[PDB]
Design a binder for this molecule. Structure first.
Ligand code: HEM
Ligand code: HEM
Ligand code: HEM
Ligand code: HEM
Lengths: 141, 146, 141, 146
């Protein structure tokens, strides 16, 4: 449960990402693939090389979905219904993986938003990604 | 795997009683039913729409027997699981693209299956030995991932 | 979410536990202590010896709580509120441990209800324990 | 751990730039804030009621320096984290009753702090090497639990 402070913190931090969200999306994936190689099992059809257009394009897609979630922080289940469907019935990514991408996203944010990545904001972003993860895996079974 | 000899004897004694064909089918079927996302790997197996469709599917039963067959062999090389499972590890990674978490889910399901079958005979300490074994196998199977 | 089917399955299997809930609760704890020794860090004050009265006593308590959640399957968050607060604010058990106990609870039921422990019931019981765990960990942060 | 020469060097060189004092106090504080349940071991530290109160707490600050101190020394024994942390592993188990999962949380918090601090310099490949260290240290610290 995101508190009003959390929602604020999240909207602020994400506000600063702005036009770089796609690049950050892409960077977080690259960090995930390198740090947790088991995650690559879900992308056998991608070119996972540094700066592949598939990874870049996919980073955009993820970033965009995050944006939309911040935008509907109050209505996540609904803003992300389609994505919850996609993941539960088609992609079927094991739930453990969501924690790995979430962590790589925090690291990416930390690395690029030094002034904004305060302890309270770090706490909020973590809770936020957790909530996003919960929504995305809620129709699994 | 750090199995005390008395843990190794206990594992081995029980395994003596298992019908690998039957347990293999039960373990694999239950995995697909309890964690339906695991069905992602078996779209060529046909109908997995209901518990009966899964549990009775001749393809699930045959595959389950194959998986537990490989596992039983692992039980005779408890000393060198990594070596034992190396080519299978490579295959699962490079050809099948199976997330290693699947190996841990199967291990847990197998433990419930053994509990289901042996009842009281599957004592707290016997379970502890099997938990070590299943983790060692999952680890051995994931060792060649990259 | 628990479906009507899940609910029927859980009431039915738990129905069979009946008067043995206490003993099964205690057995689940012992299996957990033996298989996942790190869980012992939370009971430094307990006699964890085989047949410990403390473990017996604790097993009943856990079992009573599960029995209560089954009785209120349509209002678990409220039926368990108090327990949720206790775990979040006093006990502060790391979330990963819930999955360990759930697993040992499933092993115990399997070992005692061969006829009822069908694939379908196994699936419903797993989803149920996951739901109880989620409620108990909901106020953590 | 299973660190590559190139991986060993990257770790080594970034660490040389670390102010253990500051990074240690920040890592522990962030832990207490992000994962509030970890505060269960530090009741005697005082006021942990707010991020500000945690971050400002000198007891927290000094504990963080002690922890990162020990971590730092372990980086000199990357080839035997197990023997390096054996006594600390026993202490954490037998005296402090700290669930090893906490070791994992800290590790990840540590990685976020390094990224926070080094920005640009904390590249995907450098993060990968640190993830291996952090996991290796957590494993070593959990090794003597029973
Ligand atoms: C933070 C949580 C996540 C979000 C918001 C997210 C979002 C998305 C989006 C927006 C898409 C594209 C949908 C479309 O094509 O219309 C997608 C696809 C996909 N996602 Fe998820 N994702 C998340 C976590 C994960 C994780 C952890 C994995 C696996 C490690 C994963 C695996 C995939 C795969 C394999 C695809 C399809 C890629 C393709 O074939 O182009 N996702 N995801
Ligand atoms: C104890 C762990 C396991 C063992 C010992 C094992 C063993 C095997 C063996 C011996 C084969 C046949 C190899 C070949 O075709 O050359 C196989 C194939 C396969 N395994 Fe594994 N397996 C295990 C777990 C799993 C799990 C948990 C999954 C997925 C959830 C999985 C997915 C597959 C698939 C998709 C195939 C290929 C099936 C086909 O022919 O279409 N395995 N495994
Ligand atoms: C679904 C799972 C769980 C249920 C239903 C449950 C329920 C309970 C209940 C009813 C109590 C007694 C509170 C009272 O005095 O009224 C309790 C206490 C406690 N629980 Fe939980 N619990 C669960 C999971 C866990 C886990 C996984 C752990 C750690 C491994 C844990 C650790 C504790 C501890 C340390 C106490 C206090 C015992 C004492 O000091 O007497 N609990 N729990
Ligand atoms: C990188 C992992 C860690 C390392 C290397 C480490 C190391 C240390 C060291 C060197 C001490 C000094 C005490 C003595 O020698 O008597 C200590 C104490 C302690 N540590 Fe750990 N620690 C780690 C992680 C943690 C975590 C994650 C927690 C809990 C969240 C924790 C809780 C404690 C506590 C409660 C004490 C006792 C302090 C006191 O007596 O006031 N440690 N640790």
């Amino acid at each position: 449960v995101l508190s009003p402070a959390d929602k604020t913190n999240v909207k602020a931090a994400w506000g600063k990402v702005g036009a770089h969200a796609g690049e950050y999306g892409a960077e977080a994936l690259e960090r995930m693939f390198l740090s947790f190689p088991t995650t690559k099992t879900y992308f056998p059809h991608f070119d996972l090389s540094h700066g592949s257009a598939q990874v870049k394009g996919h980073g955009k897609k993820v970033a965009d979905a995050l944006t939309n979630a911040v935008a509907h922080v109050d209505d996540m289940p609904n803003a992300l219904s389609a994505l919850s469907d996609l993941h539960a019935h088609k992609l079927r990514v094991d739930p453990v993986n969501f924690k790995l991408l979430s962590h790589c996203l925090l690291v990416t944010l930390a690395a690029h938003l030094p002034a904004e990545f305060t302890p309270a904001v770090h706490a909020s972003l973590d809770k936020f990604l957790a909530s996003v993860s919960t929504v995305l895996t809620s129709k699994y079974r | 795997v750090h199995l005390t000899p008395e843990e190794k004897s206990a594992v081995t004694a029980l395994w003596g009683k298992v019908n690998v064909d039957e347990v293999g089918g039960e373990a694999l079927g239950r995995l697909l039913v309890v964690y339906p996302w695991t069905q992602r790997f078996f779209e060529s197996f046909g109908d997995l729409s209901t518990p009966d469709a899964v549990m009775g599917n001749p393809k699930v039963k045959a595959h389950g027997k194959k998986v537990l067959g490989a596992f039983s062999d692992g039980l005779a090389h408890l000393d060198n699981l990594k070596g034992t499972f190396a080519t299978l590890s490579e295959l699962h990674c490079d050809k099948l693209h199976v997330d290693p978490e699947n190996f841990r889910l199967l291990g847990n399901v197998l433990v419930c299956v053994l509990a289901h079958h042996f009842g009281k005979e599957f004592t707290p300490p016997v379970q502890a030995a099997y938990q070590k074994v299943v983790a060692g196998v999952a680890n051995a199977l994931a060792h060649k991932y990259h």
